[model samples]
Target chain A: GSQSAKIKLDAPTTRTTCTNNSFKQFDASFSFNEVELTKVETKGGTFASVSIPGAFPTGEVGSPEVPAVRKLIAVPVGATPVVRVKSFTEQVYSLNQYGSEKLMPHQPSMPEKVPFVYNAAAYARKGFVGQELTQVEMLGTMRGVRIAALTINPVQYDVVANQLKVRNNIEIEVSFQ
Target chain B: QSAKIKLDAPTTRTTCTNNSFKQFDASFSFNEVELTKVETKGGTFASVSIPGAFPTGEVGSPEVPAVRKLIAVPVGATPVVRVKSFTEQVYSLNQYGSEKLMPHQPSMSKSDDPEKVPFVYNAAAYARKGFVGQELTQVEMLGTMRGVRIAALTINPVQYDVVANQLKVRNNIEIEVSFQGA
Candidate 1:
């Protein structure tokens, strides 16, 4: 005899258009969290010590694909506009795969990508505050705000070209009270 | 020129019920604000940290008024035979891996030449990099035969890319937990 039996309950799902009117806007920002910042965690060793050099020599340089500035754009998904967020350019140090063999001077650390943080209030202060909508309008046409997705771009370096690249994509978090 | 950001998650409320062990149902709604991942001291177990994922407090004065008198207790000494909850979400993040191997990357800028393309920025290609599905379906249970207790049930859905070093997550779970007595 069995102590208990498996049962299948018919649970029907439902949908609602109700909005937590208390929720006014969506807020978002980005930065690296709990990552190994003090040292570089390479594949071979436990970690490698590196420093953010005060200066770099000529010819050894890095560039950002996108501008190192923050912007709040309303991207339209169907009829509703979702908030799209971006962070500034950050840099980290990396070593050349093969260099300073003997004749060459030791290659100093090069800048690439470093992690920083972001916040919501600045957008409002910067004049990017989102438009307001009525509850009726929210339930009717305005679906309200939501985070579509979040993207974290990894730091990349080209040992051969001696170039570094870094960037990130982000979306805000929204909730109804 | 962008500034930095910090993590902020809302709080959670909890509740317990005192019923006569009858078959009844209750539902609760949960919303989350922030999402991040933390590792165990050993660095072996990694979990996404979502603020205020559950309801907390006493039966009468719950964090959320609607969840009051929801959990079911045993009738006399009869044991709780079954429990079920139907959960759903409105919006969720799609899953994607950190990087993809490239046989040749001619389109890439010669300045930062590499053998692999960072797919974290490609939403279309991201769909193909990782698998998506429910991470948890059942609830955590506790107690003995005299009584069966469930303190908290979590509903978490996550998409992470170790290579990119990021985790995308959201939670607005509506839990309709049902209890059956034997």
Candidate 2:
């Protein structure tokens, strides 16, 4: 007689975005490749071969849909250059709670609000003349060891003769390995 | 006895963007004394002496700068690219200028507006990508011919490439001269 067993797999839907310096409600899922494998290890370290798939691509996606965000902020003409970060607030929501309990305990039923800050100087060099310099913020979670998606928003200020004049908004999306 | 002679320096103003080049020509007369000294800015410059006693102008292209000859220029000063002259002559001077100038003209040739200089590419599309091109094509000729001062010019295109993921251009420029009244 031959032995047989039945197994089931689960899939989760996730969505992510940046609001006020943090990543908001992002739902994700992890998939295991092996069927009841006891000890899984790789050359690098002891690990299980579980494939984690996400909706977003990894790295920066330069497209109209993922427009690079920008905001205008004021700075003195001769003032010392200082690095600033863009602030974002995020809120993720979902009715399903099965996956949320495994990864993020306080998710789905209890929405997760996160505030994230990203370095601005990494993207731009010199500030524009008579215009506010733009600062960028980005946030995202790793889908797996090799992939991740993120949202970045930049802020700038319009200045005339060294005074803050107005504010501008710019946004962008990216995914990378 | 050597008499001092002074000619009023003509002032010329030309503006160019990253898109196209500009060209200009000028003629000046000198009675005796060898021609000496030339200066220019904003783009490349090239000039040659007219041949023969009557001075016949021949168009010559300016040489591109070598790696060692390249220099970081200040924001406003015109760059001096080429200079040469004759040693002896009471000859009249004829000069011509040409430049593979950047695209300063805003409109394409297809436009119906006569007041606008037509560009090679679509202006509307170019605006999104910013200005393009690398070299300034400039040429100047000065010499005596037919007792009549003469100057002519031509503008050409430059072969541009992306440097550091941005556009930079280089061009071959030539200047021609011919007497209008003999």
Candidate 3:
């Protein structure tokens, strides 16, 4: 570990459809629980710092390749969409192979370690307000809403392209209000 | 996207390394989230991968990581560790290669959701999880030929796909660890 960071993320809040007869028009938001970290010791000694991330960057940490944002979406995994994330861990990795490898690369001090783990935390909020949809019609189809959440499992990597490839079956979980 | 791991991994199963390396002591476990054939979506990605990721970093080779030496736990130090995790989107930035490599990646983005793409992400991992932040818990350094030790390591701020190689923090991990007495 290099530095202790106090992180807090707030998912501004997005809206999704309310179809279930029991619920309707809901409010969705992204929040998280507190993430704690254990210590990292090396042949030399224990690390000097550790901090977890709360959410992905509101924008870019520095570039698009590094959004540093917690991704949240609503899922139709169920008749009633629930919000969830594959994991609530976020990190800041910097390699000294060349330039700066610290958060806000343009920052001041030099980070003690190149790769460090920060404590991570975040949760999703789905508030089902009032009103329901027309009960998913009689002709019923399998598809539901588009609002998405984060999910993983069959994600692949393209070493040649250096791209993290997702095959798209992973689902997201949402909290119903 | 959301979690597809229906069950929490069994309460940590303890394991160790082949070497009792100097001052090195540890335990290991995994939260196996098996994705038989799924899809993932809805995340704001930072970049394709870390900026200066060790180009030689691969998961199945014998080479070691440059950072490996930095993490080599001191002789006799009790450093507990939590290692690599998987997510189509999970990745570690700026890391060299170690264990934690997957057998294969999803073929295509299978989510019926038109917006969905394959769940793809990369991560950093220790070669093992016992002594010296590096080890041969199961295998050797993917790209590095040197034998380092330790597993359950954690990383942040970048993503590296052994498959595609890219980059982490918040949910920062690979080897989750803690230290005991001194």
Question: Top DockQ: which candidate number?
Answer: 3
Superposed by TM-score, candidate 1 places the C-alpha of residue A78 at a distance from the truth, in angstroms, of 50
TM-score for each of the candidates: 0.24, 0.15, 0.18
| lDDT minimum window of 10 residues, candidate 2 chain B | B12-21
DockQ each candidate and list the results.
Answer: 0.01, 0.00, 0.01
lDDT of 2 at B176: 20
For model 2, the stretches where C-alpha displacement exceeds 4 angstroms are A1-92, A95-98, A102-177, B1-97, B101-182
Instruction: Give the residue spans of candidate 3 off by over 4 A.
Output: A1-177, B1-136, B144-182
Question: For model 3, how does the per-residue alpha-carbon lDDT over B26-57 read when each residue is reduced to its tens digit?
Answer: 23222322212222242322212121112123
Q: Please give the range of 10 consecutive residues that has the lowest summed lDDT in model 3 chain B.
A: B46-55
Q: Write the per-residue lDDT of candidate 2 for residues B4-99, one digit (tens) a residue.
A: 222222211111111101211212222212222333332432222111111111112221111110111222323333212212212122222232
Give fnat (model 1): 0.00
On a 0 to 100 scale, what is the lDDT of residue B81 in model 3?
46
What TM-score should be assigned to candidate 3?
0.18
- Candidate 3 residue lDDT tens string, A90-125: 222222222222222111112465443232111011
